[PDB]
């Protein structure tokens, strides 16, 4: 029974942590994607302002 | 009878603890995903404010 416990832990644990630690990547993607679009859109808008 | 008790304990125990300890992973996913989207959305919004 504590065997089947360890397989269940490993399976659900592995799947969930894979999803969350990938969401870390989409998160840092959001971080520096916001940072880049900040100045990018900034220069389009300040070029269309004049 | 206390045998079938131990198999029932092991099975239900294992399934439920696998689900809860995976929910721990989605929970820490929520933790640092909120932390990342905080500053990410912060910099989109403070870049569109000007």
From Swiss-Prot, chains A, B:
Q: How is it modified after translation?
A: Phosphorylated on Tyr residues after EGF stimulation.
Q: Which domain of life is it from?
A: Eukaryota
Q: Where in the cell is it found?
A: Cytoplasm; Nucleus
State the oligomer form and interacting partners: The vault ribonucleoprotein particle is a huge (400 A x 670 A) cage structure of 12.9 MDa. It consists of a dimer of half-vaults, with each half-vault comprising 39 identical major vault protein (MVP) chains, PARP4 and one or more vault RNAs (vRNAs). Interacts with TEP1. Interacts with PTEN and activated MAPK1. The phosphorylated protein interacts with the SH2 domains of PTPN11 and SRC. Interacts with APEX1. May interact with ZNF540.
Print the domain comment field.
MVP 3 mediates interaction with PTEN.
Function summary: Required for normal vault structure. Vaults are multi-subunit structures that may act as scaffolds for proteins involved in signal transduction. Vaults may also play a role in nucleo-cytoplasmic transport. Down-regulates IFNG-mediated STAT1 signaling and subsequent activation of JAK. Down-regulates SRC activity and signaling through MAP kinases.
Descriptive protein name:
Major vault protein
Tell me what organism the protein belongs to.
Rattus norvegicus (Rat)
Its ancestry begins with:
Eukaryota, Metazoa, Chordata, Craniata, Vertebrata
Q: Which gene encodes it?
A: Mvp
